[PDB]
Amino acid sequence: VTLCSPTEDDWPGMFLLAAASFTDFIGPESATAWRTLVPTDGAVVVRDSEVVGMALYMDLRLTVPGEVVLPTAGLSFVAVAPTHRRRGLLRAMCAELHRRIADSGYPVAALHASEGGIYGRFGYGPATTLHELTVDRRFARFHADAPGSSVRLVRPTEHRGEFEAIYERWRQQVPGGLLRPQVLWDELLAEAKAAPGGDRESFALLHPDGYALYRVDRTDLKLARVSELRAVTADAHCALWRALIGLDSMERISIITHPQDPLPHLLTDTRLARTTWRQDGLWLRIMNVPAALEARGYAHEVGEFSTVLEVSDGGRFALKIGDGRARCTPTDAAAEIEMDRDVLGSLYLGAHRASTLAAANRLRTKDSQLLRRLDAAFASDVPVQTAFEF
Amino acid sequence: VTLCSPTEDDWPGMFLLAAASFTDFIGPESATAWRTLVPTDGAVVVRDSEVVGMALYMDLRLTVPGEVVLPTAGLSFVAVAPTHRRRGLLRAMCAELHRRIADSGYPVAALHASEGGIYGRFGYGPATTLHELTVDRRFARFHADAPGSSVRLVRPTEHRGEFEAIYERWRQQVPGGLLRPQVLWDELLAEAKAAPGGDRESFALLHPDGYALYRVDRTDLKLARVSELRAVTADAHCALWRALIGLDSMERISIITHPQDPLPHLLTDTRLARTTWRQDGLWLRIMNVPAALEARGYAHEVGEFSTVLEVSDGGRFALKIGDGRARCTPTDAAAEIEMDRDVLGSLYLGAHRASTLAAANRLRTKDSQLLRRLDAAFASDVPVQTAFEF
Amino acid sequence: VTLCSPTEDDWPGMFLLAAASFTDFIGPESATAWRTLVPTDGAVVVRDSEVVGMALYMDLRLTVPGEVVLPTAGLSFVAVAPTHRRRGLLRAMCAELHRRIADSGYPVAALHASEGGIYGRFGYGPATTLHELTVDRRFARFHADAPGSSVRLVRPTEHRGEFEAIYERWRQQVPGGLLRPQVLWDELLAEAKAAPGGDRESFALLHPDGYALYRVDRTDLKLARVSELRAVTADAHCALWRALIGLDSMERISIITHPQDPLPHLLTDTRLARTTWRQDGLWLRIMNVPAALEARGYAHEVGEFSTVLEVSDGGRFALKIGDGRARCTPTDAAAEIEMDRDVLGSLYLGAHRASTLAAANRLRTKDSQLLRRLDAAFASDVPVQTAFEF
Amino acid sequence: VTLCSPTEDDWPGMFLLAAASFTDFIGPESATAWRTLVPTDGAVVVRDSEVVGMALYMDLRLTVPGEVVLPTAGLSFVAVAPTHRRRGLLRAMCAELHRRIADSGYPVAALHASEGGIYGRFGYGPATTLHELTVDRRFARFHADAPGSSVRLVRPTEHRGEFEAIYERWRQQVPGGLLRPQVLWDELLAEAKAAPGGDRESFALLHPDGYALYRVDRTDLKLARVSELRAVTADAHCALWRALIGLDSMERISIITHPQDPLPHLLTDTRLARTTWRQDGLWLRIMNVPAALEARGYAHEVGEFSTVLEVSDGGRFALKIGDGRARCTPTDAAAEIEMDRDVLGSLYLGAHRASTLAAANRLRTKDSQLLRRLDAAFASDVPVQTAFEF
Amino acid sequence: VTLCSPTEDDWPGMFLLAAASFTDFIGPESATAWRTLVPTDGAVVVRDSEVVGMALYMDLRLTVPGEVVLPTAGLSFVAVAPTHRRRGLLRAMCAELHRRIADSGYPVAALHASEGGIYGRFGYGPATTLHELTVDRRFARFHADAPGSSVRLVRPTEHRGEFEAIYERWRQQVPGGLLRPQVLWDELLAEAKAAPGGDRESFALLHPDGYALYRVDRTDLKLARVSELRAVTADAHCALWRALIGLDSMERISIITHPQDPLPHLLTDTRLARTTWRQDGLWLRIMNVPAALEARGYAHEVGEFSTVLEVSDGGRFALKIGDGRARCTPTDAAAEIEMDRDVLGSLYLGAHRASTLAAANRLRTKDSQLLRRLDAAFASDVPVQTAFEF
Numbered sequence A, B, C, D, E: 001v002t003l004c005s006p007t008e009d010d011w012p013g014m015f016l017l018a019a020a021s022f023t024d025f026i027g028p029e030s031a032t033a034w035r036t037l038v039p040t041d042g043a044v045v046v047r048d049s050e051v052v053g054m055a056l057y058m059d060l061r062l063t064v065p066g067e068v069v070l071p072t073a074g075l076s077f078v079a080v081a082p083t084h085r086r087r088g089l090l091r092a093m094c095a096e097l098h099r100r101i102a103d104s105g106y107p108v109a110a111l112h113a114s115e116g117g118i119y120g121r122f123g124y125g126p127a128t129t130l131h132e133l134t135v136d137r138r139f140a141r142f143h144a145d146a147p148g149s150s151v152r153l154v155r156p157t158e159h160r161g162e163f164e165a166i167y168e169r170w171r172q173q174v175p176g177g178l179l180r181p182q183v184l185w186d187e188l189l190a191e192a193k194a195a196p197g198g199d200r201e202s203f204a205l206l207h208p209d210g211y212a213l214y215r216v217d218r219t220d221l222k223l224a225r226v227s228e229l230r231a232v233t234a235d236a237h238c239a240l241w242r243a244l245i246g247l248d249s250m251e252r253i254s255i256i257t258h259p260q261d262p263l264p265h266l267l268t269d270t271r272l273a274r275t276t277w278r279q280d281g282l283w284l285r286i287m288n289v290p291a292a293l294e295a296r297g298y299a300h301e302v303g304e305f306s307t308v309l310e311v312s313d314g315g316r317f318a319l320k321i322g323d324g325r326a327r328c329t330p331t332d333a334a335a336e337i338e339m340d341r342d343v344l345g346s347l348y349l350g351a352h353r354a355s356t357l358a359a360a361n362r363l364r365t366k367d368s369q370l371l372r373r374l375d376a377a378f379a380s381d382v383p384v385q386t387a388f389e390f
């Protein structure tokens, strides 16, 4: 078992391991489209010869609080052969890619986790929260206060330009936003086709400042699933939900959204927007603590404050936050805040409160005033959302 | 149909309407215990004679941010006969009790809603959030960082004093906390008995600084339901969860908790603490805007700021917040923030963000800086929880 | 929003609205086959430009009691864009088509309702009843009295002529019968093909005087679904059910039939033919009360009688019924029977009893003798059935 | 944490731990009846004071192949407080009881396992197999060859003597048979009463040479559950099943029986007796290898043979089997068969084949002829059954 | 209704009856591949003309105890038209094929039964047992004693030669083994392809001495179904199960295996390998009692013994068994053992014990010593397995 960058010869073995490893496997043609996002030396394989281990990263652009865009290494296509469990192959592959990612100059790495108990040990913390809402739309009435026909029902394939422009405005404004390159729009509008024996046809609801893609469920013919809703203004968001509640042949509309989705508040009965499912979305590994902490914006409400942050096996820093900006410098002074690297990734986009992690002792300080100040400073004005799975 | 305070003669008719109206009806003896919390003139009935309408309030003590305790009118036992729907009986009863509550000097009223689409119109806003967690405890491993045998398995009836003392410390520290009077401890430790053909026996896990009451589900014999967990320190909270994960005959532990429960963070796999259910807990009606706004503490992080708040059909106030305190005074100056009374009740304990309600247009301002300052000021340092249903 | 007859340019927009509106959407090629049944000026669209509203009628031939065939306008493809709910588009489209249908000389209009609470207001009453029977065929034994190998198992595509001839004899004899044109036989024998990932292959049971088309359910491989059973004699009906009970690999046979299906009575245990589902089939709007009332046959058993029938906003008539025939003439004499137009459509084919509608006060008279006579006169000798959905 | 024999003072703490540990807890009165089977020094408790650990054994009589009855220590009431998991309390309690059991002169210990992954490490092997059969009795027809009204429907409480005499004949003839003392007959005929909100009334089917106790399921009113069927002759077994298939109001009869139950072979369709569930019944720990191996009968079919058996940390023996008897003597000669103690317990009553355990390498030899001879010798002429849970 | 061998003209009618009779119908192309195994005069049809009845046999090679291979007639494609039930068509077809099979020189016939209550009357007895195991692989840990990366994850289509060679070694060693001809390998590796709207892609786990073919379930995406596992050594069997338990994205692995599968014993918790389903596999009809009884090996453990066996309407024989061989000769001496022909087929491969069939009176003797000797003699050293369905 040796670890190396794959050759063109390795890719059929990698597709075999992928097919056996991922039930939702996009297939070889779709995988070749995603490969365009993998930089030279972005992939590792383990051979025993046949491929028993693989991992790669993609070049991504992640929006963080303050509308700042970071170069981000997106880990994906991570698989160990069922024949080679418990031989340290994942630890070896993650160590090699992290070395390359760090040397390449990426301040953060990100991934979507297949299981929740794996990536904490490699320094990844869950940084966004997926929240499924199911609306029983037969009972749904809009509140007198709710904004609002500016919405059109359209064929997705015919309005790509308009989707692309709205999404581009969306992703620059929202923490968790990702640049979506051309190949991923090619892949998205191909999944919008009805498949024989698979997913039904997708429709779009199109506003000047928002869109929703939805399809009826394969089996439950009274359920509409919203695959994607991107709204740049509150008017667009409300207009799109007026149109979705107007699907009079459905009993239920479901969407995977974020905890601060205002939909419940648009209705006279907030309870009709039931939370049916919750899960970690994007996981972050802070590769470079100083570059990451200095890059994001902080809340202007909290007054200037200074502390000493230690990350376990990741450095100790004098951290000064004021006027929405942070300066993070090396120091050997006594730490006032200690935490593992994963905990920092969980705080970084504003999804988890420092005081909540402190209550579980994932984050240690003897100053409760400092906890309150961290909480307020790392909060995001714009609620953090999840762009797309990779 | 006339509206009046019930006589002793009215109470069998009220119990009949209760029995027909509430499936979870506590019964006449339990109801007579709760009656001790109803003040003279705390109840109204509508006669056609027989009782076709009733409503009452109880004298409660609610903890709000800054560890401040407010006298609170708890609406309960609200029922209209199925024979007298759509005759305005609820509107008439709510108007009469609100008059009495306001004249009596209560700054806030509260209730638990049977449905979500009813009480918004009478000025009640959902102020706390119930969050059910289900843990598959067969997979649960505590994180290296988690605190921690200080916990004892005990019979609830034998440790009432200890439960009472822990709960009393809990409710004074936590927004949403309610004083639990003797009659409600009498009722709680009677529901801890096994019933023939009903609920199984309750056990307690007792720490110096926390307790958990739990019972196996009637039908699902691999599910333990935690009815109540009160923990005054993080050590107590973690110790109690170590003991509950040690119920080796159960597959699943469920609890109704709050969104900021640190349990997920105590585990190596945060995902094992699944959110299976979410709902509005306590609803608040702010009876007196100035008395309520001046009574609670505000976050010390936000700098002194001033604005003009209008509540629809509820006054206009010059609101000045600084050094964690608010001054709220009458004014005829232009409003900078407008909202219905229910919206204010939703903001009041810190469960809902002003910027989330603004996105749904439940709260209108033309200053986004002011929105950020309201958000930060109305935030609660201690996460808001739900004490007990009434 | 203006209302007009569609141009050839409008039909892709109409197919888009159809696809988004109907989950069971037959698709553009199948829809173009059905278009052959739509007369010139049989369709309306609403443009905002894009199609936000459509409705059309087809030229049909409906059999009514006395084996009389009426020209019938079959409303279909009725859809409002989810973006344009609650703007009166359905009321405007139904008013325009009803004007055209009435001017064209149709005595009745008909439809199949997607929901039960919509078409009553436009004068449509449910006129036939669908009754699903599920037979646990493992227990089914034929009664000593039951008639009866004259039945052949065949490929549907190879015996079209024989199906067509049996159906043609069936539809002329039975109230609810519809002429089935060539394009609908083309469509029926195409749905008899197995689809990859969809419905399984259809088989036929063929008798000289009856046929049954059946297929195994997609998911429940022990359920056979009879899509269509047409039997012109009792011998044919019994023979076909002997063959279906002989599907020894099935546990259950289901069929959508009518309330008077004699199948339960063919068995030693009538209970084995369980009623699993009931619903309104065909809805009727009587366009011209006199032409419709004079056109159908009436029961020869009831003696000659005369009354005055008023239809709300639909005329007042002197109605004389004797010798199985009715004469319906204008009058200003006092009404003895009043009812909304929808109620008349419900009475017209014999599926609902006048005395049942009277008990709900949908039909008012002060003469109970007259009620008994209406009941007996409007009864159908041959039980009313449902031909095919449109 | 110290380990000692319980005092009379300890038993309320033990009942509390029992109640919290066992959902099917028989209760304090029933537990006091079972206590009569616990010898002086048959119980251990761990105190921290409160009871955090308990275990005991009962004096039992187990029938092994050759109709030989062994004194048997039945481990039961084994519980560790959920507050004291992972502190070695079970290992400490099992070690102390095993010392006492061995010193007392018991050749074998037995238990029923709450989980399958626990007791292998303490030398217990699963020795009997529970097999649930569910008969769809609506289809059940007896074979022309099946024996056979000698069976009476009776009230259990009125025929105790007759049940006791049949069971006593049953348990002396069958490997796995246990003596059932008076206190357990007291407990059995008390569970035969209908409980308000619990189990329905039990009935008995009584033959001169067999009985069946059955009751309708609490929730599934078309399921009869046979709690116990004891038949000393094939005639009795068949007669009792003729009576149970005659419960014409039931769809299904279920019983927990053994893999060699001849019921399937009594029917024309063997498939109607579906195996719906399988599990380990009784677990055995061989305390004394020589006393246990010499005590049971062996199959007379296999010719005299000799080998050397080693049990891991349990001795090495020259084992000579011939004329249905074994002689087991100490030796230092090379082992021909090696196995852990648990494996021996699994072989001992004839439920598991030596060649099946060898295929999993739980039992090692380099002689396949010796494997065949062990298989044939340890086989039981009478199929092994499970008497009652303890 | 006349009975004859089909002409080439008959085969479209036979495919129609097949399609209507078998839901799992392989289709006309797959059926034409299987036809290559049908000898000249291996098929009968009944015409009324159209095909209302068919049956055929295939030339197979069945392994019986002692590694002896018998020519075997495999009955298949047996169907009666649902229009011709209860006219004796099956009895007539089975009688004609049995005449041909017997005259052709086959000692045994075999089939897979669609129902359990049919083929006993034609002399077929169930001879193998299918046992579904479902492993919750999340809990599965291998025992310290379990053997063991020699296993490779591969594409089935690319390793046909290797599968064929392993299977060929497997089928010669195991009772129930069948020769698998080229056409059936063609058919197997075509079912290994993903179908649009049907089964997902198959993967292989390949060892020098074993293979497993598995696929994820269509609907349950956490279930892996092992279609086939063939292991010639215990090492191969254990290695393949280590690889299958390493499918970390699955919760459950299911396999249809045999009752003596050692998998449960490879695990620390035997209970994790749950038996979820049990059914008769292969049915045998002994065509020639003497040729069949003399052909198989018998257990060398039982000493030489002699008896007189009568088969009902099948002969009486002096049966002498010693040194693993039987001599079976005609006699008119008193029978000591009587049984129907089906019972003999059930005993023949060792799946059912003579003493179990005797307890149901399917097998009559007055000598219990003789029963014990039959049991021991007809036992199979190698556990009987089921090769493939036909």
Ligand SMILES: Fc1ccc(N/N=C/c2ccc(Cl)cc2)cc1
Residues within 6 Å of the ligand: A026, A031, A032, A034, A035, A038, A056, A058, A076, A077, A389, A390
């Ligand atoms: F060569 C490759 C490079 C990158 C990749 N990542 N794609 C993986 C992926 C994950 C989730 C979805 Cl919803 C869609 C695609 C796949 C292949």
Ligand SMILES: Fc1ccc(N/N=C/c2ccc(Cl)cc2)cc1
Residues within 6 Å of the ligand: B026, B031, B032, B034, B035, B038, B056, B058, B076, B077, B389, B390
């Ligand atoms: F006279 C009465 C005065 C007050 C009351 N409120 N109790 C109502 C109530 C609601 C919920 C629970 Cl879990 C328990 C009790 C009931 C009767």
Ligand SMILES: Fc1ccc(N/N=C/c2ccc(Cl)cc2)cc1
Residues within 6 Å of the ligand: C026, C031, C032, C034, C035, C038, C056, C058, C076, C077, C389, C390
């Ligand atoms: F252009 C068109 C004209 C008429 C139509 N009606 N067809 C609609 C329809 C409804 C139900 C079924 Cl089962 C099948 C078809 C559809 C399109």
Ligand SMILES: Fc1ccc(N/N=C/c2ccc(Cl)cc2)cc1
Residues within 6 Å of the ligand: D026, D031, D032, D034, D035, D038, D056, D058, D076, D077, D389, D390
């Ligand atoms: F003090 C005691 C001594 C022995 C015991 N064992 N009984 C335990 C037990 C287990 C299973 C059943 Cl179905 C019934 C009872 C219980 C208490």
Ligand SMILES: Fc1ccc(N/N=C/c2ccc(Cl)cc2)cc1
Residues within 6 Å of the ligand: E026, E031, E032, E034, E035, E038, E056, E058, E076, E077, E389, E390
């Ligand atoms: F012409 C034919 C000759 C023999 C046959 N037998 N095949 C039948 C069959 C049964 C089960 C399976 Cl899993 C696969 C195939 C089918 C047609």
